[PDB]
């Protein structure tokens, strides 16, 4: 038989669920989630790295002219100049005065080291969800990893769990993304064509090792000076090397909901949002009968003292009569008070550790088909900040109608019956007529 449960998706939080079946011992189970992740389905657009300006030798022709046949290459740029007088170490290079020409050619290419460092922009689509749970119910406690797709099921000792669907698609991502060595960023990177020179990725490559590429480096050439043989080339400096300095604030720090981002592969783990549903189907190895467990009565329990902690700082001792020694499991039946000790061995006395800091929890606890109630007062703590998350899920900050709302019954108000007496004076004034 299968039934539902809601598990609050926060790491370390304990949750209790109860199975009910007429004729057997009541059983409960404790669940605690540890590992989560959201692998997003990434595709590729293009990568970018630093560029380089390969400049071959400037072939000079004296009293002649050349003709530069082009090349299928990125931004192959040809320039032919007249009126040069190259003046090298050996006097002049050639001997002519008016027909001299100089040829300067240069191109822009992907640098040799960015096979190991590079940025890669991805398009970013919907993700998935995996979980790790602890399934302690006294009988042997297993750990489990499983998906949240619903179809995927994993069973221990004939007892199976299914998880999906999910409660929310609250993503710590966007549609467009860019990944560096250890960070992820969200800026709307330009398309494959728009190589704005000096912005992000003015060089683009569709993979690590494609033999074709694209560049818009903004490259031009100028005529040399008197004497010096060189290649004056004007260029916008790198945009990629600019982006390394002119962009702080990655998503690793700006991440919502306190989740944690880790690269290789791109994943976000231990997010804290929404709940997860779970349907569980039991087996008959620990689903124990009624006429075997302790059958007690006159559950003369009580409380001891209570604090407004965030951890186990509410202690409640509870007494009872032992009919036969064994173990029985306890469980709350309202949302105000959680318990820590799942199973207490019924022998003489007992003591439980409840945790609820809202005001003054009046909560019903139960042990082996038996119902009682407890109530106390609680003082606030003295500290201000601690090093562990909450343990009371209670937004139920109201005290539930006791020990501070008694003044409502005090200041009810009363006097409406006096106006009933006044309308009785109306009844006695109409008797004459």
């Amino acid at each position: 038989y299968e039934h539902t449960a809601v598990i609050p998706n926060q790491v370390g939080f304990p949750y209790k669920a109860h199975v009910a079946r007429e004729g057997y011992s009541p059983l409960t189970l404790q669940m605690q989630v540890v590992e989560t992740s959201l692998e997003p389905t990434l595709n590729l657009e293009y990568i970018t790295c630093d560029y380089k300006t390969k400049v071959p030798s400037p072939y000079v022709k004296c009293c002649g002219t050349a003709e530069c046949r082009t090349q299928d290459k990125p931004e192959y740029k040809c320039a032919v100049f007249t009126g040069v007088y190259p003046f090298m170490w050996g006097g002049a290079y050639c001997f002519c005065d008016s027909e001299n020409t100089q040829m300067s050619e240069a191109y822009v290419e992907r640098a040799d080291v960015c096979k190991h460092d590079y940025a890669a922009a991805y398009r970013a689509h919907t993700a998935s969800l995996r979980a790790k749970i602890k399934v302690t119910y006294g009988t042997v406690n297993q750990t489990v990893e499983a998906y949240v797709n619903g179809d995927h099921a994993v069973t221990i000792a004939g007892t199976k769990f299914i998880f999906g669907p999910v409660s929310t698609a609250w993503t710590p991502f966007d549609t467009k993304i860019v990944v560096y060595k250890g960070e992820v960023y969200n800026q709307d990177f330009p398309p494959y064509g728009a190589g704005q020179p000096g912005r992000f990725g003015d060089i683009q490559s569709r993979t690590l090792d494609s033999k074709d590429l694209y560049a818009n480096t903004g490259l031009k050439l100028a005529r040399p000076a008197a004497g010096n043989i060189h290649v004056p080339y004007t260029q916008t400096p790198s945009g990629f090397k600019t982006w390394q300095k002119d962009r702080d604030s990655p998503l690793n720090a700006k991440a919502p909901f306190g989740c944690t981002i880790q690269t290789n592969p791109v994943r976000a783990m231990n997010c804290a949002v929404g709940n997860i549903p779970v349907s569980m189907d039991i087996a008959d190895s620990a689903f124990t009968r009624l006429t075997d467990a302790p059958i007690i009565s006159e559950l003369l329990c009580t409380v001891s003292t209570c604090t407004h902690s965030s951890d186990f700082g509410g202690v409640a001792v509870l007494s009872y009569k032992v009919e036969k020694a064994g173990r029985c499991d306890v469980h709350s039946h309202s949302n105000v008070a959680v318990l820590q000790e799942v199973s207490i061995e019924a022998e003489g006395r007992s003591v439980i550790h409840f945790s609820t800091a809202s005001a003054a929890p009046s909560f019903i606890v139960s042990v082996c088909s038996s119902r009682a109630t407890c109530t106390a007062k609680c003082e606030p703590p003295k500290d201000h900040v601690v090093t562990y998350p909450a343990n009371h899920n209670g937004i139920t900050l109201p005290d539930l109608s006791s020990t501070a709302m008694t003044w409502a019954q005090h200041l009810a108000g009363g006097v409406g019956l006096l106006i009933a007496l006044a309308v009785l004076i109306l009844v006695i004034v109409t008797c004459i007529t």
């Binding site: 991440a255 909901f257 804290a272 800091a357 703590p381 201000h384 900040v385 601690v386 900050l397």
Partner: protein
Amino acid sequence: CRVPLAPEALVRSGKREATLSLHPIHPTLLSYRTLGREPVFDEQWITTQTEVTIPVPVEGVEYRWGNHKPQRLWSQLTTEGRAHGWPHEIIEYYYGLHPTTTIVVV
């Protein structure tokens, strides 16, 4: 490659606000963020002796200074004087702990 760790920061724990005072030997970086749906966050460069006052709501606050592990902090519940001590200290005790509803109630 090795890298120097930075000295510790002793926190001082006020109501909903935690103050951590740095003694940097080198110029370093401070980073912190809230934990809730609303991502309120900042980061700062630190050069000399200076205090920084970061908020702490109930949803939690993480921060990391230098090359350390990221550290977490959480307001415990709230603090006040005497709760349910009979005369009107109940409304004073509910002057903490989301007070706006209490004002419209009174």
